[PDB]
Amino acid sequence: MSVSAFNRRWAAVILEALTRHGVRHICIAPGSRSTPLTLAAAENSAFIHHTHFDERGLGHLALGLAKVSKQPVAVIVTSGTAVANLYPALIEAGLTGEKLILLTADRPPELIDCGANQAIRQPGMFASHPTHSISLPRPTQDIPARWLVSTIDHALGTLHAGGVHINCPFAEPLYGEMDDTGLSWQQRLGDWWQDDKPWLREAPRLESEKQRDWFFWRQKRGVVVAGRMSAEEGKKVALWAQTLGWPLIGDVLSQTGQPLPCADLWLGNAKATSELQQAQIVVQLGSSLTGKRLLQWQASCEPEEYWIVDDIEGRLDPAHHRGRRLIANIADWLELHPAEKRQPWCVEIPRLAEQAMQAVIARRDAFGEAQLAHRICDYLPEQGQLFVGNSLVVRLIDALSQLPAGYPVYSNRGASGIDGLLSTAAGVQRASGKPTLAIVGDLSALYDLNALALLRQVSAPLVLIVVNNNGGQIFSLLPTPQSERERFYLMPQNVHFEHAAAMFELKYHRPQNWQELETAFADAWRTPTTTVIEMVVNDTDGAQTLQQLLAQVSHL
Amino acid sequence: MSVSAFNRRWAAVILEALTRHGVRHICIAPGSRSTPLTLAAAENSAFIHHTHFDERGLGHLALGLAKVSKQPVAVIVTSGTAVANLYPALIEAGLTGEKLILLTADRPPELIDCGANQAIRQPGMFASHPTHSISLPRPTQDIPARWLVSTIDHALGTLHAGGVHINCPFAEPLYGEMDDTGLSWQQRLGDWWQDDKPWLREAPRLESEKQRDWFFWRQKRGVVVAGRMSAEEGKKVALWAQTLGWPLIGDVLSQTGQPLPCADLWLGNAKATSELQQAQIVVQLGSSLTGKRLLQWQASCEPEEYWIVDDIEGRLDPAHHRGRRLIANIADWLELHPAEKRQPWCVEIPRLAEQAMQAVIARRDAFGEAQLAHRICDYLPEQGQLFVGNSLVVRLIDALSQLPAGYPVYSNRGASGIDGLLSTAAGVQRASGKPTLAIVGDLSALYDLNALALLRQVSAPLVLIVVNNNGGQIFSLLPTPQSERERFYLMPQNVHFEHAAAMFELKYHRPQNWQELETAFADAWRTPTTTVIEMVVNDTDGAQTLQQLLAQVSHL
Ligand SMILES: Cc1ncc(C[n+]2csc(CCOP(=O)(O)OP(=O)(O)O)c2C)c(N)n1
Ligand SMILES: Cc1ncc(C[n+]2csc(CCOP(=O)(O)OP(=O)(O)O)c2C)c(N)n1
Ligand SMILES: [Cl-]
Ligand SMILES: [Cl-]
Ligand SMILES: [Cl-]
Ligand SMILES: [Cl-]
Ligand SMILES: [Cl-]
Ligand SMILES: [Cl-]
Ligand SMILES: [Cl-]
Ligand SMILES: [Mn+2]
Ligand SMILES: [Mn+2]
């Protein structure tokens, strides 16, 4: 008889099913309509439970979790605009591949389009952005549990990457006594409840075949571009490229070690671009390439074929080159297409890359964001991970430093949003347990401000560098019109973060030089908490230093 | 020739066209892709420009503006998750009628699903939540300006209520000199550029017909239920119900003056409900009724007829009574269905309503949220406006105080989200220019924390009361389960707002008695600046006081 009790039994099947697909982490926002989902999750000891009050934050927390653990991470939210806040993190997931299982509570069909409070049209509301969309029916004992677990099984079994959105109508009485309504119904699943596999096993592998002409292509004048990939993938790619004798352009996100550093600088030099005109094939592994000069070279170069090896799906070359798009695990792929010993063919690029770095070393003293980015390894935590925020920071680290091979870097570099960086960071460190360094801009920090709440619960030191250049200074770098740049572009907020840290009880440091920055780090890494280091810098110095260094290099 | 210059030409046609439909406020977030729209907006002298860095807050700021002004308000954002953030405000607008014109910038078609940075598929991404979706084509001179303005003219001309999503591909060379490409193409529109009406006027009106059996019905035992309507409509409805001799159950949002106050209390009393069983007809004006007892009585009652009169569309009875759904401006409808002076048929309800308010007044003294709610009248600015947050506050002011007839009230009571209350308040005050009192919960305040940024800029004094009962205390009033309530429901963040206030250079108080609250307000209505008043209150007291007042009143 009890609707209250049955809703929970319905929800218990949902959650148990996700358990069979490697879902450990679950992110929960407060609600009433979500009561069946939340209580089922709460009482299921397979989960590690995370909670937060801002649903946009909640999505990004889940996104950081899935980013690092490579596992499907679940999200429970209540009906209404709560669901709509998951949209940004879902979008990023859909572009970078994080498996997010969004379980969104709903009013039941009777309470739709009739002025019911906090009742909206939720089925379909993320359009094409989920990989799978399940819109569950009203819960009824007339639909057997086997269908409910099968539906979920298929969605998860076949999920290569990106998000699944499972809309969960519940009618209400939501609370009440657990009388054993639906226990019978649940029992038709038999000992599946004691099993560790899913009910229906459906896991087709999606993968491109061996390139049988690889033995031919591996001998051409090639170039290796390396975008976003795993830390270990980064090392493998470096040795591979080296063996071929092909120049490797490694992104900040590559973790290759960057044997030809300051690509964003040297690629702007005619000697480099014309040397590369000799490249017969370009093999790019991973994507989301950072620098302007890399994108621009890429968009303009004309090899015989262009390859992109990556674990995600769909076309990845925005310049649409003739070539191949190869779906694979990068490490697997490298083993399936091993490098072969060849003499290098580049003469000028190794030279320019060295000079480029030197021009930057020559500028390392000024206490500016350009320099912080140059010097950033100095500050990497031992056995840690770097989280790079968006806008100027990622561009400057990519252009001016040479990150160590196999040192973990993480970013939200799919949609490049500045909406969820702090909570994504929270996820990232939570996932792995590692000491974590996260560097972010001032608007970025202002955007995801309340995420500082999550930053009270960290398992290893997290250092949050907020670079404060009073506004979105990237729009200084781009050729924006002078007269409406302050108001409509930069949007300085004229604020500091001392009071932010105070509010949430985090250590704060506002260093005036390098000696003070190192002493802030020394204290920070001592304790499994989050320290906020505000780096206040002159608004336009970073962008100008980049432009100058670009110009300098382009004359060498 | 110049794509740059034409992007801007195209955009200015769009923005100019909005001009002819009373769009005067415009809300801009920072970005590169949105350049054509933003620059066109900036140079167009019709618009009052508003800016913010958080796009979710931006949407809600526009919601605020559109709410008060009852004009269409435009929003510009850039491509990527920026767009996705408009969702919450858009869902709200869709339910309550605010006219939000979302001009969302987008990459051109060549750059979608090809690994291009910050490119996602936007056309259709709000599903069916917009009233119209204009998905614009790639800008070209081969499509006449008369098409562009006409498409915008149609969507805006026909717009009864809710948002229009206008997606705007712009191909890049976004910056460049402003040569005279597409001037010739603009001129094909002739002297329309000096006109003040639309190019295509298509403005059909949507109305219900005169109810020609009204003279029959107005003599039966009727009940007037009044929900969200304008402040002038509240006064009229009070005059009307009084004349007919029908009891008026009036919501916080109604501005009717509430002449049977504390309905949430007296509707729980059996004598009141049985007297209401004699109701032959129920005429509700407006919608989104607040309280449980009203929502519950409304659900259960069985009058021969049930009428809902509101200028929004669709069904508004979540109990789906046999009756009438009349789409009309309330002020107009009342004139078209005038009252006739008649002897009030209710006997005990007035007595119960008085005794209920007395029960409440007898409890005014304790320094807590329930008591703040009850006496909020005392703090209302002269010639000002109220903005009520969600959760416990709106429930408490509806239950425990009697707001003045005609004194303007506003809320986000469609989807009842807690995600945009401060930024909505901002736009609410900005639209009217009136001194504003806005009260909100702690988690509410945290959710929209960065909106404190906008509150630095206020055309009249704004007081923001933040009730801090350490968590979502509504889940203390709802019969949620014991051992998982704090963690999965209330989610206390153990925090204050002194520092938040400080960060954003806003005056802060934290009164500890009625006197200290009076001193906080002495200063608060003089200067056109924002004052934060944090009300620290025992977590659980509000909920229990309501519960007790409920129990006390049912015994009358
Ligand atoms: C959600 C979202 N909105 C807007 C943008 C456009 N955008 C890119 S960078 C930027 C400004 C970043 O400001 P800040 O954190 O101060 O970084 P800085 O420009 O100084 O590197 C904006 C608004 C975006 N990427 N994501
Ligand atoms: C965007 C959104 N997420 C979640 C909810 C569900 N919800 C309704 S009330 C509430 C708690 C509000 O807490 P607070 O601001 O402290 O007010 P209090 O409960 O103490 O009145 C929540 C989470 C919602 N309405 N909107
Ligand atoms: Cl809820
Ligand atoms: Cl159904
Ligand atoms: Cl960026
Ligand atoms: Cl700390
Ligand atoms: Cl942009
Ligand atoms: Cl609410
Ligand atoms: Cl100042
Ligand atoms: Mn900045
Ligand atoms: Mn609260």
Curated annotation (Swiss-Prot), chains A, B:
<dbReference type="GO" id="GO:0030145">
    <property type="term" value="F:manganese ion binding"/>
</dbReference>
<dbReference type="GO" id="GO:0070204">
    <property type="term" value="F:2-succinyl-5-enolpyruvyl-6-hydroxy-3-cyclohexene-1-carboxylic-acid synthase activity"/>
</dbReference>
<keyword id="KW-0474">Menaquinone biosynthesis</keyword>
<keyword id="KW-0808">Transferase</keyword>
<dbReference type="GO" id="GO:0009234">
    <property type="term" value="P:menaquinone biosynthetic process"/>
</dbReference>
<dbReference type="GO" id="GO:0042803">
    <property type="term" value="F:protein homodimerization activity"/>
</dbReference>
<comment type="similarity">
    <text>Belongs to the TPP enzyme family. MenD subfamily.</text>
</comment>
<comment type="pathway">
    <text>Quinol/quinone metabolism; menaquinone biosynthesis.</text>
</comment>
<dbReference type="GO" id="GO:0000287">
    <property type="term" value="F:magnesium ion binding"/>
</dbReference>
<dbReference type="InterPro" id="IPR004433">
    <property type="entry name" value="MenaQ_synth_MenD"/>
</dbReference>
<dbReference type="GO" id="GO:0030976">
    <property type="term" value="F:thiamine pyrophosphate binding"/>
</dbReference>
<dbReference type="InterPro" id="IPR029061">
    <property type="entry name" value="THDP-binding"/>
</dbReference>
<keyword id="KW-0464">Manganese</keyword>
<dbReference type="Pfam" id="PF16582">
    <property type="entry name" value="TPP_enzyme_M_2"/>
</dbReference>
<dbReference type="InterPro" id="IPR032264">
    <property type="entry name" value="MenD_middle"/>
</dbReference>
<dbReference type="Pfam" id="PF02775">
    <property type="entry name" value="TPP_enzyme_C"/>
</dbReference>
<dbReference type="InterPro" id="IPR011766">
    <property type="entry name" value="TPP_enzyme_TPP-bd"/>
</dbReference>
<keyword id="KW-0786">Thiamine pyrophosphate</keyword>
<protein>
    <recommendedName>
        <fullName>2-succinyl-5-enolpyruvyl-6-hydroxy-3-cyclohexene-1-carboxylate synthase</fullName>
        <ecNumber>2.2.1.9</ecNumber>
    </recommendedName>
</protein>
<keyword id="KW-0479">Metal-binding</keyword>
<keyword id="KW-0460">Magnesium</keyword>
<dbReference type="Pfam" id="PF02776">
    <property type="entry name" value="TPP_enzyme_N"/>
</dbReference>
<comment type="function">
    <text>Catalyzes the thiamine diphosphate-dependent decarboxylation of 2-oxoglutarate and the subsequent addition of the resulting succinic semialdehyde-thiamine pyrophosphate anion to isochorismate to yield 2-succinyl-5-enolpyruvyl-6-hydroxy-3-cyclohexene-1-carboxylate (SEPHCHC).</text>
</comment>
<dbReference type="InterPro" id="IPR012001">
    <property type="entry name" value="Thiamin_PyroP_enz_TPP-bd_dom"/>
</dbReference>
<comment type="pathway">
    <text>Quinol/quinone metabolism; 1,4-dihydroxy-2-naphthoate biosynthesis; 1,4-dihydroxy-2-naphthoate from chorismate: step 2/7.</text>
</comment>
<comment type="subunit">
    <text>Homodimer.</text>
</comment>
